[PDB]
């Protein structure tokens, strides 16, 4: 195995080696004793990191084996174990674990490794404390990333957990299920050093995975560090940031990563976290921060399905409206959004939040007092966005923005119950988003952009974007008439002939659609089939 | 490039003239501190110098705004923050009887600055600004079209105003009774102005998503025509 450092192939052997050390009892222990001695000698090899790991692993196991005292009495702990293990840590035994874990016969590997990971907690705690204390003292109040990372062995361990456990909830549950891991978590919660603290937050996020695990993580902070302390930290940072006008980004990014993970996988609890991080998160968003996008993503997670959207909409409108001066024209409104949502992350976050809020509802006469009211200006903003999208950098990025946009557009189409008409209403008809949505769609890069999604089709994620493109076109055809007659007159800039020539004339889209009926995804095929009917 | 330098010069010089003119009107000033005028007439000045030294201390928000236009300073927060001050200052002087009087003065102040900036979207976010203005004026007597008319006068086109406004309409989850009314006034204002749009399907229209234009667009096409501007 030594005669491999990078070679991924090493992973194949880890199951055998992890389990082998696990079953040291089998060996004799004349043999085990000999290996132990040989390994201490073997500290000569820094170049082979993976030797260093495996040996360190053996030690983690050996300690347990020495439990039958014939062996243990014989040995002196400081010489026999701690000195060597410490040497291994120094020689990057944790780092390579992290690598094994990060770069994840799965059953054998997962089982054997999780046994490894756990052995380290229970048997090793002396080492953890030794390292933690070592780290706290070492740095002194221009540190380079390399200097920060040198001593970081404890944090690396936390990451080891994060990578290994992630997904896998199964494994993750072990932490939460009984109240030593649970001790481990409590212990980790205690480590105050900003870097340890941030990795602790990240590790827990990984642990939060199941709907079930997420629930425990909720309780962990709430009941037996509290959520309140967390928001407090965010609040404090906010003040420091603004009063002032990397370390913080690490901490904050972690704070958000964690809140996001749980809020997403939760239920009625969501409201509780919502009311509490909502107010604080809103305040943080006002500050520039690199981060803006991230809080928007978290905010979105908080947004509830029901009526009690209102606090969120106000925050958003207020948070676009506040600085901007709006003339009585449209452009000034666009400017408000453009000024605030300066960078790419800001926009993507914004889109996710908006997608969520627009899902099914918002307040009447929104923006009243400050500006011409209503939802319409937000859709105009998308002109800035998906108009632009075509000229992304970075396909992955373009797709990232395009998708939220399609989902929003589709939602707005569903947003009005067309059926009531075919088989203060006026005001309601004015307020719904379906109106501005149709207006923009008719604006022929708008139609084109939607159309190109169809022309160029097929990772799986991209496939979804395609389905949405079709579904939207179908929806438009079905109710194109409704908009022109009923909706447009009420609420009575301009009209239709443009999309048709382009869809109908322009042929490639028609042919592409034809090809789609066959290709399995029923959503794409069934919809493609419907469209041609609508076009005809 | 000579032209480049010349035009920038003309712009900056103009600003000083404006600042200079205001200094006369301002009553916060002392005649003996003539030195400022001497400085103004004397030479072109650094933009930051003009901004920091003059605009902020003499609270000439309009000037500050125009200056940042030339600079082309995009930062929306700062731009918006400046706008907030201008609006707030306006409130101070007002007394109420002059709801109409202030109405005019307010429109007057906005239109002037608006004409200079309106070409660029950063200082004049039409989208952001319109509501802001409505909200401000809201604590005043109202006639529909008062807000939008200023933007039209500002130099904003009917077509530009329409799309953004419509977006504001549909975009907002809410009541926006105000927006509906104003847009109603806008459409009425627009149709009469060009002969192109003119006639009957309209009178019925009392702003809703019963967009007369929207219906028109569906059938014929989106192609309104060239931009229409107020004469």
Curated annotation (Swiss-Prot), chain A:
Tissue: Expressed in the testis.
Location in or out of the cell: Nucleus membrane; Nucleus, Nuclear pore complex
Signal peptide: none
Family: Belongs to the NUP186/NUP192/NUP205 family.
Subunit structure: Part of the nuclear pore complex (NPC). Forms a complex with NUP35, NUP93, NUP155 and lamin B. Does not interact with TPR. Interacts with TMEM209 and MYC.
Job description of the protein: Plays a role in the nuclear pore complex (NPC) assembly and/or maintenance. May anchor NUP62 and other nucleoporins, but not NUP153 and TPR, to the NPC. In association with TMEM209, may be involved in nuclear transport of various nuclear proteins in addition to MYC.
Disease affiliated with this protein: Nephrotic syndrome 13: A form of nephrotic syndrome, a renal disease clinically characterized by severe proteinuria, resulting in complications such as hypoalbuminemia, hyperlipidemia and edema. Kidney biopsies show non-specific histologic changes such as focal segmental glomerulosclerosis and diffuse mesangial proliferation. Some affected individuals have an inherited steroid-resistant form and progress to end-stage renal failure.
Name of protein: Nuclear pore complex protein Nup205
Organism the protein comes from: Homo sapiens
Gene of this entry: NUP205
Residues represented out of the complete protein: 253 to 924 of 2012
Curated annotation (Swiss-Prot), chain B:
Post-translational events: Phosphorylated. Phosphorylation and dephosphorylation may be important for the function of NUP155 and may play a role in the reversible disassembly of the nuclear pore complex during mitosis. Disulfide-linked to NUP62. The inner channel of the NPC has a different redox environment from the cytoplasm and allows the formation of interchain disulfide bonds between some nucleoporins, the significant increase of these linkages upon oxidative stress reduces the permeability of the NPC.
Subcellular location field: Nucleus, Nuclear pore complex; Nucleus membrane
Tissue expression pattern: Expressed in all tissues tested, including heart, brain, placenta, lung, liver, skeletal muscle, kidney and pancreas.
Assembly description: Interacts with GLE1. Able to form a heterotrimer with GLE1 and NUP42 in vitro. Forms a complex with NUP35, NUP93, NUP205 and lamin B.
Disease: Atrial fibrillation, familial, 15: A familial form of atrial fibrillation, a common sustained cardiac rhythm disturbance. Atrial fibrillation is characterized by disorganized atrial electrical activity and ineffective atrial contraction promoting blood stasis in the atria and reduces ventricular filling. It can result in palpitations, syncope, thromboembolic stroke, and congestive heart failure.
Biological function: Essential component of nuclear pore complex. Could be essessential for embryogenesis. Nucleoporins may be involved both in binding and translocating proteins during nucleocytoplasmic transport.
Family indicated by similarity: Belongs to the non-repetitive/WGA-negative nucleoporin family.
Designated name of the protein: Nuclear pore complex protein Nup155
Gene that produces this protein: NUP155
Included range, full protein: 1139 to 1375 of 1391
